[PDB]
Amino acid sequence: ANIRVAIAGAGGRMGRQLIQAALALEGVQLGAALEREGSSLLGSDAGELAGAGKTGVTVQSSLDAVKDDFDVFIDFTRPEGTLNHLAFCRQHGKGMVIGTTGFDEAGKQAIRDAAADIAIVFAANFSVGVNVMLKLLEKAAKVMGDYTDIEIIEAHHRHKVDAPSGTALAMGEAIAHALDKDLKDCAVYSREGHTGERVPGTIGFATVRAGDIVGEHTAMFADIGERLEITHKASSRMTFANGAVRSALWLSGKESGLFDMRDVLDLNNL
Amino acid sequence: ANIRVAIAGAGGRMGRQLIQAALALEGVQLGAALEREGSSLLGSDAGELAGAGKTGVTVQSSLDAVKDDFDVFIDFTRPEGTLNHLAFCRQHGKGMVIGTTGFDEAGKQAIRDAAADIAIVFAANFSVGVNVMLKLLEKAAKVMGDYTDIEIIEAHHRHKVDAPSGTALAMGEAIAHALDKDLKDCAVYSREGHTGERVPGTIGFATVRAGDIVGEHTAMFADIGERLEITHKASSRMTFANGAVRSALWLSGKESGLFDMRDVLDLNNL
Amino acid sequence: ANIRVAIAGAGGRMGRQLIQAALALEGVQLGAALEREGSSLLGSDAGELAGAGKTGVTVQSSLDAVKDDFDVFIDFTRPEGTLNHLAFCRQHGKGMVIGTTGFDEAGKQAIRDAAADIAIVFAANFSVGVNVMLKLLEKAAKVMGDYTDIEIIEAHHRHKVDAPSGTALAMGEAIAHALDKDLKDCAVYSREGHTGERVPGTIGFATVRAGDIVGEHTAMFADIGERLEITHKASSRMTFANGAVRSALWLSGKESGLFDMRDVLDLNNL
Amino acid sequence: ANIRVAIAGAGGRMGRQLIQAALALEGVQLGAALEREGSSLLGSDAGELAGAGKTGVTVQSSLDAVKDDFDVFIDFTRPEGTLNHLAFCRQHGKGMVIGTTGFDEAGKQAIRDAAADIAIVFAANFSVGVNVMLKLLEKAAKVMGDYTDIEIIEAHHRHKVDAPSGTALAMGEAIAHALDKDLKDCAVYSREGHTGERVPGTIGFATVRAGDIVGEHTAMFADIGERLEITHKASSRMTFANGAVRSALWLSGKESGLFDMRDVLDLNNL
Ligand SMILES: CC(=O)c1ccc[n+]([C@@H]2O[C@H](COP(=O)([O-])OP(=O)(O)OC[C@H]3O[C@@H](n4cnc5c(N)ncnc54)[C@H](O)[C@@H]3O)[C@@H](O)[C@H]2O)c1
Ligand SMILES: CC(=O)c1ccc[n+]([C@@H]2O[C@H](COP(=O)([O-])OP(=O)(O)OC[C@H]3O[C@@H](n4cnc5c(N)ncnc54)[C@H](O)[C@@H]3O)[C@@H](O)[C@H]2O)c1
Ligand SMILES: CC(=O)c1ccc[n+]([C@@H]2O[C@H](COP(=O)([O-])OP(=O)(O)OC[C@H]3O[C@@H](n4cnc5c(N)ncnc54)[C@H](O)[C@@H]3O)[C@@H](O)[C@H]2O)c1
Ligand SMILES: CC(=O)c1ccc[n+]([C@@H]2O[C@H](COP(=O)([O-])OP(=O)(O)OC[C@H]3O[C@@H](n4cnc5c(N)ncnc54)[C@H](O)[C@@H]3O)[C@@H](O)[C@H]2O)c1
Structure with a gap:
């Protein structure tokens, strides 16, 4: 088993496909499963949440309440949501895989800047x-x-x-x-x-x-x-979910840097 | 052997594909091969003209000079050219297969009208x-x-x-x-x-x-x-050439009427 | 609202897609949701069972226990299972939509024969x-x-x-x-x-x-x-699920007969 | 203008497409046009031979009779024919583009061996x-x-x-x-x-x-x-004809070596 991951957006269309890609993918363990504050949780994250039950992983609302059970953060939510997660992570050195699109420039500069303290894989298409x-x-x-x-x-x-x-x-x-x-x-x-x-x-x-x-x-x-x-x-959207999940495992061992899929796929040596 | 045909436009891109579709197609004989007045003939129509030599059919400029050696007229030329052929044919009762596009309305009314004395197959796409x-x-x-x-x-x-x-x-x-x-x-x-x-x-x-x-x-x-x-x-453009040539053989036995490919293909009984 | 349907095989890959096709399809109401005896139910059929919760329809094991709440039976299970349902239905005059494949001949003769007392739509591909x-x-x-x-x-x-x-x-x-x-x-x-x-x-x-x-x-x-x-x-397999569900609504008003999709789609008048 | 080429097989299906690719392609001049001994020539090679007339290039049967009017030999004929051309060329230092397939091994060893005295581009697919x-x-x-x-x-x-x-x-x-x-x-x-x-x-x-x-x-x-x-x-087969003709112009300046399309297309630096 390995690398623990936190899947934010657990009940959103992307967040589900991520829980599955994670459970059924080797070298990665499901540490946490987040969600918006004021939304119906469902404890066993990937359990009910993602088709196939079980997972004593419970869909919390915190973050500090999970800091110690996930090495990497996978975010496919909203720019407003993302910037917040980006701030907790960068403080406590959690690496992130970012699939949220639609940031204003001021937005991307955050990510760019944050990438000097933590390792980020941020990409437009994760397939x-x-x-x-x-x-x-x-x-x-x-x-x-x-x-x-x-x-x-x-x-x-x-x-x-x-x-x-x-x-x-x-x-x-x-x-x-x-x-x-x-x-x-x-x-x-x-x-x-x-x-x-x-x-x-x-x-x-x-x-x-x-x-x-x-x-x-x-x-x-x-x-x-x-x-x-x-x-x-x-x-299927699972196509993007394997890409993101493969990237987490990739960011394993890394600290500081902004990468993308070419980084991960070694496509520049191709 | 049968039905004699006259292929107008023998040296034009369509006219060539017609000579071939005719020689190598049963029930149809190459009666004539026309052309514009003031253009290099080449006697053996389909001979030199269409890839495969022979054919003692010679590419004339007349019409009255060919009246008795073609039963049907296949025209893929120009509206101006077509209207002329349409007039000789309608006089001497030759049936026509018309693939010239681009007639002004006054143009189509000719065809419509002529179709009461002779049998016409006129269509937008002959494939x-x-x-x-x-x-x-x-x-x-x-x-x-x-x-x-x-x-x-x-x-x-x-x-x-x-x-x-x-x-x-x-x-x-x-x-x-x-x-x-x-x-x-x-x-x-x-x-x-x-x-x-x-x-x-x-x-x-x-x-x-x-x-x-x-x-x-x-x-x-x-x-x-x-x-x-x-x-x-x-x-290949031959696709249209077999359609036109199959239509001539179809107009065999017919007199008066305006038809199209559904007529010929019996697609209204389909 | 209308026609009540019973979706056998509610937790099987086909049975799920059926609950969805039924809830979100007009003129059809979800009467029952069956299952094998000795399998984890989940009451709210289409609720948990099929992605989108709710439905006070509960996944029973009976049949006589549901006789009065479904007009039509949709079966995508097993030949052994099917023959049984076929027997209850034919007794109590419930019509059926049959998507179970793999019957031995003796099998199809049942269906054929049963179709004289009840209306059956049975087909190899329901798309x-x-x-x-x-x-x-x-x-x-x-x-x-x-x-x-x-x-x-x-x-x-x-x-x-x-x-x-x-x-x-x-x-x-x-x-x-x-x-x-x-x-x-x-x-x-x-x-x-x-x-x-x-x-x-x-x-x-x-x-x-x-x-x-x-x-x-x-x-x-x-x-x-x-x-x-x-x-x-x-x-997606939903493709077959809309076909089956559209057929139930079609069998509405019918009694005796064996039909297929051409029947339902009126393809013989096409 | 440049590089003179000799197109063997001028009246064969490939040989035609070559005359066209050559006339209408810059940096290459049609030096000769060969053919089998005991076949109807047609002087103006690409003239009659390849659709578009002209070319005071005449389809000979020789070789020594053309030695001084072609720099490169393009061969899409027969292994038996090819080996012969290969022998004249290798003597008088003419480079060759070889598209004849079907050589027995002893055959390919010839080519390999000949490639030490002259420059050869030999390939299985010239597209x-x-x-x-x-x-x-x-x-x-x-x-x-x-x-x-x-x-x-x-x-x-x-x-x-x-x-x-x-x-x-x-x-x-x-x-x-x-x-x-x-x-x-x-x-x-x-x-x-x-x-x-x-x-x-x-x-x-x-x-x-x-x-x-x-x-x-x-x-x-x-x-x-x-x-x-x-x-x-x-x-269209012209696809292979541009490839071969582009290769001749490529072999321009070269002497000794066996190359293929990766050589010519620089695909090993890709
Ligand atoms: C990079 C790539 O290839 C790829 C692929 C597919 C989707 N996406 C992006 O990933 C995101 C997910 O889209 P989705 O899964 O369809 O959509 P959706 O069903 O709406 O899920 C959105 C998720 O974000 C959660 N969320 C929403 N707003 C906030 C917030 N302010 N704070 C915290 N959590 C919040 C929401 O509760 C849910 O989990 C989107 O921005 C997509 O554009 C990217
Ligand atoms: C119906 C169908 O499916 C189909 C298919 C392909 C082309 N076409 C039409 O058939 C015609 C042939 O096009 P093409 O073969 O590419 O073109 P193109 O090579 O220009 O041939 C034109 C032919 O018409 C001859 N011609 C030109 N003007 C006259 C004139 N005033 N009098 C007598 N002969 C004349 C010309 O000499 C040549 O034989 C065009 O109008 C095309 O649009 C139809
Ligand atoms: C006609 C058409 O286009 C179409 C399309 C897709 C599948 N099918 C058929 O429909 C059936 C469903 O396949 P599936 O959904 O993948 O498979 P699957 O997940 O195995 O579901 C089988 C279903 O049948 C239930 N079941 C199994 N055996 C019995 C039994 N003896 N008694 C009662 N219930 C039983 C089982 O509990 C489950 O609900 C199969 O026979 C498929 O071949 C047909
Ligand atoms: C490499 C590539 O991509 C490619 C593509 C297409 C064809 N080819 C090959 O190139 C050759 C041409 O095929 P083709 O053009 O269809 O066929 P085809 O019409 O038969 O032409 C054969 C040509 O070779 C000439 N010829 C035949 N035998 C001899 C001989 N013993 N001596 C001299 N000349 C001779 C013949 O007269 C004619 O010019 C074949 O071996 C094809 O397999 C290769």
């Missing part, structure tokens, strides 16, 4: 699959990227409010960059009516919105006579 | 594959169409000037209709920035533009837990 | 999506089926023991039949080493086995120059 | 797209390869005689290797009847055979919750 794909797209842009036509199709469930996906964009920059360009100089997002021919040097984006699709990203580099395509399909 | 797919989409809209999320993705080579494809639209109406709605009341073509959730009852469209893709059309009806998808992929 | 797709494949085989190359690819999670899928087969017969042939005369299942060219008139099958894929079925009819493809993707 | 994809698969196996389920689907036209594709195999080894295993210890090629669960550690292969598909290769690494997929689609 290993998406993280590799991003490195591949790079190598690839470096050969065919140039002289090939480059389009990015992403599909999402019917409740995503913003188009294109933040991953599709992330995919776009990975590529714009590698060819040494700027995504904003060469991106095209809409195609309506008489468009005229496809401007060379541009990166187009198509976005599908339907049913419950969790998340699909495709990149193609099309030439005359051939097409390369790299697709990552997400069938 | 059998696309024509069936359209009937399927209908049956399908009639069950899941309703309560499912309906998106249409189409991809085309880098030189298509207008987005969405005229087939994608055609796909959209097939569906809007079947559910008894109007495509213009419920179509969404662009998705940029903060979109908000996907409005129910709408039909979205995504359009990819890359390399040399000849033509790809996909329709999905997405629910919670499942997705149906119907895709037609075109790998 | 609407798969059921439509099957009707489409038919219409389609009837046009291009002939002269086109027909292949069927299916993918499943890593724990499916038998290859090809029983749906892929079901897809194969739908097609073999429509062209008036027999699947066993023209099916090819393996392709290894020097195969020789693809025999015309045959239907090939390719089967992928990986990760947690719930279920993917694709049918293509390939010619020279074009391909039609019809794919059904299942993202 | 840039396939060559990159292969490097990507490697990086990728190195992260997710392990603990993920790995399947390879390939589709080909209806006249491929051997299954799985030689690229699919090549894909399999790229991966088996990277994880440091041997493809022959862990490959599964057929899946029929009661298979039992998917053995971990194995690489499965599914093979589709239909219509005129030129060549499709997909690799997926499937986990619980996510799938990565890398696909290369070939729409």
Whole structure:
């Protein structure tokens, strides 16, 4: 057994998938399970809380009340919630895995700054699959990227409010960059009516919105006579939960530093 | 052997694929091969003209000079060219297969009107594959169409000037209709920035533009837990050439009438 | 509110998805929730049992003890379990929706026979999506089926023991039949080493086995120059649960008869 | 203008696509166009021979008769033909791009040996797209390869005689290797009847055979919750012709050495 973890947001959609990824994953022990103050607990965290019962781990509201039973903090909640946890941790030297998105800048500066006293793994997408794909797209842009036509199709469930996906964009920059360009100089997002021919040097984006699709990203580099395509399909949010949980175990032994998934996946040596 | 055909536009991209589809297709004989006046002929039509030599069929400029050696006229040229052929044919009772697009209304009225003296097969897309797919989409809209999320993705080579494809639209109406709605009341073509959730009852469209893709059309009806998808992929323009050539042989025996591919494919009995 | 249903197998993988499909589906009320004798109940059926708490419906072991609070019986358990339920129902005139597979013949004859006293909806695949797709494949085989190359690819999670899928087969017969042939005369299942060219008139099958894929079925009819493809993707077992639950509400008003999904979906009028 | 090339096999399916790739590609000039002795020439090589007329390049039968008008030899013919060209070249120091497959070992030893006097680029698949994809698969196996389920689907036209594709195999080894295993210890090629669960550690292969598909290769690494997929689609044989022609220009300046596409594409620095 090992590394104890505290899963904040235990009853939230992400927090559940985390309890499971933790119980059924070796080298990591479920130390605590938090929650908002003024919400129905359910003691046995992962017990009732996450499908499969048991776990004498009880979903508290404290923190100081748990300081000694978790080595690492996994946070997929809210920027307001996160900043607070970030402050207790940084005081008592607990490392954190941060999957809360949506911080204002002043927000990220906290994290950056806190990362000098404690070890933080903070990332926009915690799916290993998406993280590799991003490195591949790079190598690839470096050969065919140039002289090939480059389009990015992403599909999402019917409740995503913003188009294109933040991953599709992330995919776009990975590529714009590698060819040494700027995504904003060469991106095209809409195609309506008489468009005229496809401007060379541009990166187009198509976005599908339907049913419950969790998340699909495709990149193609099309030439005359051939097409390369790299697709990552997400069938479940558990995909992100294994990534976060694998990162905790990774931060094991670490102190000070801000890392991300490339750090954890060693993708810079790739 | 049978039915003699005259392939106008013999040296144009479509006209070539027609000579091949004709020579290598049973029940049809290559009677003539036309062309514009003031263009390099090449006698043996399909001979040099279409990859595989031979054919003592010679690419003339006339029409009256060929009246007696072709039963049917296949035209994939220009509206201006077409109207002329339409006039000789309608006089001397030659049936026609018309794949020229882009007629102004006054244009289509000609065709409509001419179709009372001769038998015409005139259609927007001559691919059998696309024509069936359209009937399927209908049956399908009639069950899941309703309560499912309906998106249409189409991809085309880098030189298509207008987005969405005229087939994608055609796909959209097939569906809007079947559910008894109007495509213009419920179509969404662009998705940029903060979109908000996907409005129910709408039909979205995504359009990819890359390399040399000849033509790809996909329709999905997405629910919670499942997705149906119907895709037609075109790998070569020959796809349209077999459709047109199969239609000539179909118009065999016919006189007066305006038909299309459903007529020919018997899709209304489907 | 309406039609009361009894969900047998409440704590089994299917039985859960049923409680949800029932609570959140209009015209149907959760009357009972059964289970094996000598298993941990949990009263509030769909409550704890199916993710979302509440439901003063309690998971009993009886049947006579519930006779008066359910109009229809939904069974996704075991042939041995099913035959028993089938016997109580047929006595007290409760209609049934049967999703238990694996009956020996003597088994199906029971069902057939029982269907004269009560109304039964019994089917191999309860996904609407798969059921439509099957009707489409038919219409389609009837046009291009002939002269086109027909292949069927299916993918499943890593724990499916038998290859090809029983749906892929079901897809194969739908097609073999429509062209008036027999699947066993023209099916090819393996392709290894020097195969020789693809025999015309045959239907090939390719089967992928990986990760947690719930279920993917694709049918293509390939010619020279074009391909039609019809794919059904299942993202969750809920897909079958809505189908079964929609069928109960369908059996509302019915007495005697054996039906299936075409019955329910009106696909024979399609 | 530059580098002169001699395209042997000018009237063969590959030889044509080469004349085009050469004329319409900068830095390369069409020096000669060969052919078998006792076959209808057609002078203007790429002229009639390859769709677009002209080229005062005439399709000879010699070699010594062309020695001084081509710097590089591109051969996509027959092992028997190739060995002969290999012998003239190696004498008179002409570099070669070799796309003829099917040599017996004694055959490859020739090439290997000849490569000490002249510069040879010899490769199994000359598509840039396939060559990159292969490097990507490697990086990728190195992260997710392990603990993920790995399947390879390939589709080909209806006249491929051997299954799985030689690229699919090549894909399999790229991966088996990277994880440091041997493809022959862990490959599964057929899946029929009661298979039992998917053995971990194995690489499965599914093979589709239909219509005129030129060549499709997909690799997926499937986990619980996510799938990565890398696909290369070939729409035309021109895909290989640009690869070969890009290699000639690459061999410009070179003397002695045996290289392949990684050499040319610099993929070992990738
Ligand atoms: C990085 C990555 O790949 C990834 C993936 C999925 C979601 N997320 C993010 O992780 C977070 C979880 O989203 P979710 O699980 O759907 O949503 P949701 O069901 O709303 O869960 C939110 C969780 O945070 C808890 N919480 C809310 N506000 C506070 C607060 N002020 N203080 C303390 N706890 C609070 C809440 O009680 C619940 O446990 C979000 O910000 C997501 O955007 C990230
Ligand atoms: C219905 C269908 O599915 C389908 C498919 C593909 C193309 N098309 C249409 O068929 C036509 C052929 O396009 P294309 O083959 O690419 O193009 P292209 O190479 O330009 O061929 C045009 C042909 O028409 C001939 N032509 C041009 N103008 C005249 C004229 N005024 N009088 C007589 N002959 C003339 C020209 O010489 C050549 O043979 C176009 O209108 C296409 O839009 C239809
Ligand atoms: C038709 C369709 O599309 C579809 C879809 C999914 C599953 N199924 C079938 O429906 C059934 C459910 O499979 P599942 O939900 O994964 O599996 P599983 O988790 O094992 O659930 C089995 C259920 O049956 C209950 N049960 C088992 N044996 C008996 C018995 N002798 N008497 C009474 N109750 C009993 C068991 O307690 C549990 O509720 C299976 O036969 C599946 O093959 C059908
Ligand atoms: C490496 C790569 O990616 C790639 C791609 C496509 C084809 N090929 C190979 O390249 C070759 C061309 O195949 P193809 O173009 O379809 O076939 P094909 O149409 O038969 O052309 C064969 C060519 O070789 C010429 N030829 C045949 N035998 C001899 C001989 N003994 N001496 C001299 N010339 C001869 C023949 O006249 C013709 O020009 C084959 O071996 C293919 O396998 C390789």
